[PDB]
Amino acid sequence: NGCFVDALNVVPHVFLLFITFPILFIGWGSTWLHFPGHNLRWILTFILLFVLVCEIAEGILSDHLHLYMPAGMAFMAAITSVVYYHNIETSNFPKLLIALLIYWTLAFITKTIKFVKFYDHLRFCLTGLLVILYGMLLLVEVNVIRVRRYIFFKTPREVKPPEDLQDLGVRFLQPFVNLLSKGTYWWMNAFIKTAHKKPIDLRAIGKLPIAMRALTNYQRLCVAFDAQARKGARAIWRALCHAFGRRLILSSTFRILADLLGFAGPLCIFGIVDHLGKNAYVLAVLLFLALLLQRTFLQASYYVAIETGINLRGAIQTKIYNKIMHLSTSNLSMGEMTAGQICNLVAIDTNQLMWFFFLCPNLWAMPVQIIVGVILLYYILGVSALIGAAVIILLAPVQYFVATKLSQAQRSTLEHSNERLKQTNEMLRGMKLLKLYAWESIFCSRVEVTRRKEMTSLRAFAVYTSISIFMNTAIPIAAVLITFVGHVSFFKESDLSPSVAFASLSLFHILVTPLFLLSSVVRSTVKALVSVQKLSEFLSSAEIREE
């Protein structure tokens, strides 16, 4: 009785879609309350979306309307479950949750009956995945009733919606929104729409969240600095890496998952081309989903890296401002604590540390990316991997030597520019006395000589970067040419179907993009190193003596 069980599955989706519409229409006709498992709920709901797409694919392959209707109904049922959960996050209730729990139990029952009747006799895997997901969502609902007040004893002892991100005047809410919105920045809509109607102001934009204030970042940073001292230039670097911590690690994990999906795309291209030469529309739908997913996770990684960077900037700014207090004027008399030097410190170190902390998560995914690239191209090239492998191994050491020759010029560049800035400072605050008896030629020739030395450093850097780009293009093209020529006629005797060719070109381009980037990365990397060395020498100035 297959059609009978299909109908029995269609029923509960219908029940839920029918109870949702009155409440949804009343709600459609500013305190955010979050429940445990919210993010887990949304993750599982997206996994349900995916498995339902797969079920629709099966129903297309088989066709009999009544045989693929269950997927089309669970689709709207899951979307309406999302609508319910949005309506509950916006206003809490004990009853709407039970309204979800009933549907979850009934859908689990129907799926179990399907599984049994199948066991007695592709469908198997999809049905099992749906069973597991519905069960986990059921456990989430049981957790939610266990927490506060589904039926449990009298009073919820309910949380008292979070005042950190919801109390007085909050104009920015990244941490104060739902699971699905954080990725798209849907909240921004209002703001960007508002900005066009009325120009933006500082009183227009809000305050900063509980977990965004520079006071707490400075607090965390000084606590970590103390813990590091109880256990120098290296110490403060260790403390910075410690302090950002989990957020930084998460940014890296998001980027690595985005990278694996980014490699996954070209494989779908291979499959599409192969079926074109001969299960194809599924390749298009899955490819579209994969590309969208990579984009979402890449942008989220970039955002969290930027968050960590701005918090770094705030914390080190307030740390150096607190330390300027205890600084003694005997240092201020010396060139090391020059006022212009200290303001250069603040500004350019804000800049350099922020840029390095935006580019560091990007490079913490280059190794995993290249490794997965080669482990994917083995299965596509075959015995013709040797050529590409030799190319991407011959790339690395010459690139290391080039990067060394680059860093050496860049550091001296920074020293010369730093002296030029102080010469300009002492030239501009005395232009009156300078033009009075016209000592201009001397100071101008001195700044010209300093500019010529700086230009020598810059031209060395530029020639080295040009050689870098030359290599990063010439080695790739030679690699592609050699590999293909080798496969067709040299040894392999297996005609490369065009799918293999285009998939190889795709994976190869994905591999090429990071190499061009790393050359620019060194420019920020040595600058971050120099900025922290300067910051540590500045922190090592003479204290003021307590009475």
Binding site: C3, F4, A7, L8, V10, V11, V14, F15, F18, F21, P22, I23, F25, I26, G27, G29, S30, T31, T90, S91, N92, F93
Partner: protein, 325 residues
């Protein structure tokens, strides 16, 4: 500048940071009886169609499950005679639910499960019909439209009556139907600072309506100018006649309440007069006129105004001059 309540009678102040504990929906039908007509009609048709489709699905399924859906001659009698497909099943659902009872398809005494589904179908149908009639009737006692028909003059003038400063405003009725026991609550708002250093952003204070021996209410047949006399005790008594037109921020609102005859509900109307709306030293034109054998009222001169040579001075200074004269 910002207004307190708009001329049309709607409230201006937008509320922020409401600690919603859910009472907004907990008023389930006293929420939707507030709505417009298209939304309420939409949600009523959606209630009805939702219930009908639910039970049509369950009936389709039960006829499928009994096996009466499998077309066969003999060895059975369908629980519902002459049922073939989903369409005829939905036709049976709408036939029994909304109580037309066509009887081409007969539910039979062979299956008690169909008896149960019918005996719950009908009671839920009757309950949802009962509520969807009571709430639409509770709606048709919306008499705010009767709050629309009332009218006030666009601007209010002040005058000198009986040797004392007075303020005159017009009201009136727009239909034959009277309004029972209408009462006037006349209020003034102002950002006020107490002598204790306390500053309030807005301060409602009652200004009396001056009728016979007392009384808060009036009788509306013809347009009656409401007549108050500001005295030294009154809160409005301190202002100046040259500072009102442009700078000061003084909203004088009137709230007229009363129950309409035929429905019996109690409606009201609210209007504001700003410092730039009100003017000084004028007099309205007499509306009522002795016509052929009756009193004719002309609403063309309702908002008309004539100049009157009255002294222009502040009510405090006018009271001091009355002490001097």
């Amino acid at each position: 500048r910002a207004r307190f309540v708009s001329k049309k009678g709607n409230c201006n102040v937008a509320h922020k940071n409401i600690r919603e504990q859910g009472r907004f929906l907990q008023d389930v039908f006293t929420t939707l009886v507030d709505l417009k007509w298209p939304h309420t009609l939409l949600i009523f048709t959606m209630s009805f169609l939702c219930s009908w489709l639910l039970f049509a699905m369950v009936w389709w399924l039960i006829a499928f499950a009994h096996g009466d859906l499998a077309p066969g001659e003999g060895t059975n009698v369908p629980c519902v005679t002459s049922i073939h497909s989903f369409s005829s099943a939905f036709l049976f659902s709408i036939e029994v639910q909304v109580t037309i009872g066509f009887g081409g398809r007969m539910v039979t005494e062979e299956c008690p499960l169909a008896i149960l589904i019918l005996i719950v179908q009908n009671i839920v149908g009757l309950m949802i019909n009962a509520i969807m009639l009571g709430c639409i009737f509770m709606k048709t006692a919306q008499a705010h439209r009767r709050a629309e028909t009332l009218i006030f003059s666009k601007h209010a003038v002040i005058t000198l009556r009986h040797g004392r400063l007075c303020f005159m405003l017009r009201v009136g009725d727009l239909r034959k139907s009277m309004i029972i026991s209408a009462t006037i609550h006349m209020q003034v708002v102002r950002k006020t600072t107490s002598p204790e250093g306390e500053v309030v952003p807005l301060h409602q204070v009652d200004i009396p309506m001056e009728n016979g021996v007392g009384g808060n209410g009036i009788f509306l047949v013809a347009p009656l100018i409401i007549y108050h006399v500001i005295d030294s005790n009154s809160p409005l008594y301190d202002l100046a006649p040259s500072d009102l037109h442009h700078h000061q921020d003084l909203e004088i609102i009137v709230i007229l309440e009363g129950v309409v005859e035929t429905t019996g509900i109690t409606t009201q109307a609210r209007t504001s007069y700003l410092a730039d709306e009100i003017l000084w030293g004028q007099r309205f034109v007499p509306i009522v006129a002795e016509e052929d054998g009756r009193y004719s009222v002309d609403y063309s001169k309702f908002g008309n105004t004539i100049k009157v040579p009255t002294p222009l001075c502040t009510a405090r200074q006018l009271d001091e001059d009355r002490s001097l004269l």
